[PDB]
Design an enzyme around this catalytic site. Structure first.
Site, PDB file in Angstrom:
ATOM      1  N   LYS A 122      -0.419   4.593   4.686  1.00  0.00           N
ATOM      2  CA  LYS A 122      -1.402   3.680   5.255  1.00  0.00           C
ATOM      3  C   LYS A 122      -1.028   3.402   6.702  1.00  0.00           C
ATOM      4  O   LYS A 122       0.083   2.940   6.983  1.00  0.00           O
ATOM      5  CB  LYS A 122      -1.479   2.380   4.458  1.00  0.00           C
ATOM      6  N   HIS A 143       0.839  -1.199   0.000  1.00  0.00           N
ATOM      7  CA  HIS A 143       0.000   0.000   0.000  1.00  0.00           C
ATOM      8  C   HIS A 143       0.871   1.245   0.000  1.00  0.00           C
ATOM      9  O   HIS A 143       2.086   1.193   0.134  1.00  0.00           O
ATOM     10  CB  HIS A 143      -0.963  -0.002   1.199  1.00  0.00           C
TER      11      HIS A 143
END
Ligand SMILES: NC(=O)c1ccc[n+]([C@@H]2O[C@H](COP(=O)([O-])OP(=O)(O)OC[C@H]3O[C@@H](n4cnc5c(N)ncnc54)[C@H](O)[C@@H]3O)[C@@H](O)[C@H]2O)c1
Ligand SMILES: NC(=O)c1ccc[n+]([C@@H]2O[C@H](COP(=O)([O-])OP(=O)(O)OC[C@H]3O[C@@H](n4cnc5c(N)ncnc54)[C@H](O)[C@@H]3O)[C@@H](O)[C@H]2O)c1
Ligand SMILES: NC(=O)c1ccc[n+]([C@@H]2O[C@H](COP(=O)([O-])OP(=O)(O)OC[C@H]3O[C@@H](n4cnc5c(N)ncnc54)[C@H](O)[C@@H]3O)[C@@H](O)[C@H]2O)c1
Ligand SMILES: NC(=O)c1ccc[n+]([C@@H]2O[C@H](COP(=O)([O-])OP(=O)(O)OC[C@H]3O[C@@H](n4cnc5c(N)ncnc54)[C@H](O)[C@@H]3O)[C@@H](O)[C@H]2O)c1
Lengths: 218, 215, 217, 215
Positions: free
Chosen positions: B131, B127
């Site tokens: 995140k 990600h």
């Protein structure tokens, strides 16, 4: 499940696959009694089973030898045509036969899964990317063709011929927001020779007919 | 189809308009925090807004006997109850994740792991750099599909929307199953598929899995 | 940096065109010219024109640039020798940046691949590129760009799948090992940002063709 | 034509080395593994892919026979490096955590690339067979060092993977992956052979495998 000191033949004994088969079979104490390649035939004793990873053109000799010795057949040669399949069906009335374009567990597992997946992903775009070593004569690979048939439709296949790659296949599904890749890698050629041994051991003592490698394994 | 959007002005709502209009569907109802705009009767309503909006959503669906595709997260028991009462009258699909691919893969992996039970398995998820949570909830959901604890490796790089990879290995072979979210459009596509599924259906709650799999 | 440029877009209604509007407007630049397959809309005189459309559109692009003495940022791919000729003629009058790829990563890699292929001269090399289902040209411009950095023609494999903004993989292989050099455009915005950098670079420049490497390095 | 020894002769790498060296007509005159030492004749060079605990014996043997050393054992500690330096005052030594062309070419390329992509996030993913005792791999550590900074390393231990390494660079709008795959263990044995032939007749000291390859 296993057989003791099988006598076996190899069609394609001198090629890449042939030499892997000799190594794998000899390690399990099996005896090579028949050698065929483009330069000739060498018959030393009667084989219980014949293993053929060669060329479609060799298949008539392969079949005649199996009939002669009532020997089962493990066939890995790819790029078979309808004529070749007919010859095999004739042979199978006399001996047990396993024909497969891929002797790995993972491809055969995935091929079933892809038949179901494609039904849920029917509106996604789908292509195949396959990679093999630089001197592989056939493109697309048999395995790519096999996976395309599992998908139930014609899809673009891209064939890379690079270095010494044993065999990778990728199925790419795409929509506008996402992609899925299903990848298989054969770590070495030995995995196909081990599949061939499993298939040989399965065949010994079986009644005549065609058996799927899926049956050999599941 | 004629459709409504609750949250039409938000990120998801604008993505839904694009995807639905491209398939030739007609927007006849717009709801956001500033008001309600009723142009015609919708066949289906799509809600990606806020839990506070759900009462109005339910009321509108009852008024027009319209199905509901609901993506709003952070629903409470009270919201679930409203939804169940609605689903006595109309067909409803509620999901906290409309990535079609992840949902499809989660089922697929539950079956694949049984066949490859003696293969080693790990997860690699990637990600964007901001995140806050690792491992991602999707990696945890995939691990749960696999029916056992597996190593999860979490990369936090650049602006990656979300990739997940399940790696299976044995001595002679490897299988990788990968999913890539290109963007938020993936959820609007999921919502479109659910909307088209719901048209003509009998009242009740339908899982997004049964949208994708025909049960 | 140039305050409040007036600019035109050829291909304004397409995927790239809309990403350009968003990026340029956010920096306070003004769209004064819109060109599409459906027509031309001239609102004011542009300082620069941005073209991500089709090679068939280039004649009108060139004419417009000549009319307003506006520089040109060109991203359209699948250009032919005739298109390159019209560009050369244009660049006698205005500054021009033409590139098949406007990201940092690809332009960084192209230099890196020129050097890497020299050391791995005996390895096999192929390219696998992936774009969204509607991309009209194959192989991509970027793949052609990468080939040209490798100093040789190589097999290019073109996947046209879903909504993929743009992936390129250069695969090098030997008997015992493989190397893959992969680039992924996470979104189309990265190209619009490159185009904006190129537009700002061009303002005030003397006529001629400038490489996007010069814009960035 | 060389006389050589192998420390770790019975292991995965040891058996690969015997095959590659015997094919070039070199003669195995010394075998060492966990069960003992077998000295048949005096080696010109010793090849060690075993365990750090075997290094003391390896060093002693090289001193005894004034034999060069090609060392591939990973997970070496400061103590092991010290013994190796001491040895290298007497004989030529090539120590490397990876004997492939590709990794040693890439390490130099990554040193330059990281300078250009200084503000991109970077992580490493490495994958090796299920039995590999050390994590992260020596190669992952080598790559981290080429990047000139500490970077997250993710280690998968799956099936029979000879060795994969991926360097992932990420920005908000784009990603770059630099991946290397060892197709078989043979590739490392071939590197070790190149190193052993390089070493013959060389002055004492430590030589990098990059010098063996020349770049
Ligand atoms: N089913 C599988 O799991 C699988 C796996 C790997 C390879 N294959 C297939 O196995 C076959 C062989 O692959 P390879 O890499 O070993 O190729 P190869 O070129 O190394 O070996 C070919 C062998 O076949 C012999 N041969 C070729 N043509 C012949 C002919 N017309 N008559 C008699 N002998 C002939 C050669 O002399 C050699 O012994 C190919 O068709 C390949 O795609 C199948
Ligand atoms: N299930 C999925 O696949 C999925 C995926 C992403 C986001 N989501 C969820 O969708 C919802 C919307 O996310 P987003 O990113 O579009 O947020 P957003 O903030 O951009 O949009 C919110 C929208 O909700 C409206 N809204 C908020 N409160 C309201 C109220 N009480 N009454 C009427 N309208 C109201 C706003 O007017 C706006 O149009 C969130 O709950 C989010 O968690 C679901
Ligand atoms: N250089 C880069 O970094 C880069 C990046 C992405 C895309 N591209 C390229 O940009 C171009 C367009 O990409 P897209 O995805 O935006 O395409 P698109 O189809 O989404 O949009 C095409 C645009 O061009 C217009 N157009 C087509 N023919 C025309 C004509 N004859 N006259 C005037 N306008 C015309 C269309 O109306 C539309 O506005 C392609 O060549 C693509 O390969 C370049
Ligand atoms: N540098 C490289 O290019 C590279 C490549 C592959 C493997 N390796 C490294 O090589 C080493 C060996 O790897 P492998 O997979 O062949 O391992 P392995 O487990 O198969 O073999 C270890 C060998 O070392 C011997 N050994 C262990 N402890 C010993 C001791 N105390 N004294 C003497 N001998 C001892 C064992 O008997 C065996 O022969 C590992 O450290 C591995 O990381 C390095």
């Amino acid at each position: 499940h296993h057989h003791h000191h099988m006598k076996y033949g190899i069609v394609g004994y001198s090629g890449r696959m042939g030499q892997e088969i000799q190594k794998v079979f000899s390690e399990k104490g099996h005896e090579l009694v028949l050698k065929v390649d483009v330069n000739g035939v060498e018959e030393l004793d009667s084989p219980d089973v014949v293993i053929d990873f060669s060329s479609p053109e060799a298949l008539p000799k392969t079949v005649d030898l199996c009939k002669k010795y009532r020997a089962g057949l493990v066939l890995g040669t790819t790029a078979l045509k309808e004529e070749h399949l007919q010859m095999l069906r004739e042979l199978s009335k006399e001996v047990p036969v396993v024909q497969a374009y891929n002797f790995s567990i993972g491809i055969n597992v995935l091929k079933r899964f892809l038949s179901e997946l494609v039904k849920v992903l029917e509106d996604w775009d789908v292509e195949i990317v396959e990679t093999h070593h630089r001197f592989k004569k056939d493109a697309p690979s048999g395995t790519a063709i096999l996976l395309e048939s599992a998908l139930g439709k014609s899809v673009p296949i891209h064939s890379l011929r690079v270095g010494g790659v044993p065999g990778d296949h990728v199925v790419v599904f795409g929509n506008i927001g996402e992609t899925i890749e299903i990848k298989h890698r054969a770590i070495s050629r030995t995995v196909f020779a081990i599949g061939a041994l499993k298939a040989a051991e399965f065949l010994v003592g079986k009644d005549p007919g065609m058996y799927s490698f899926e049956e050999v394994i599941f």
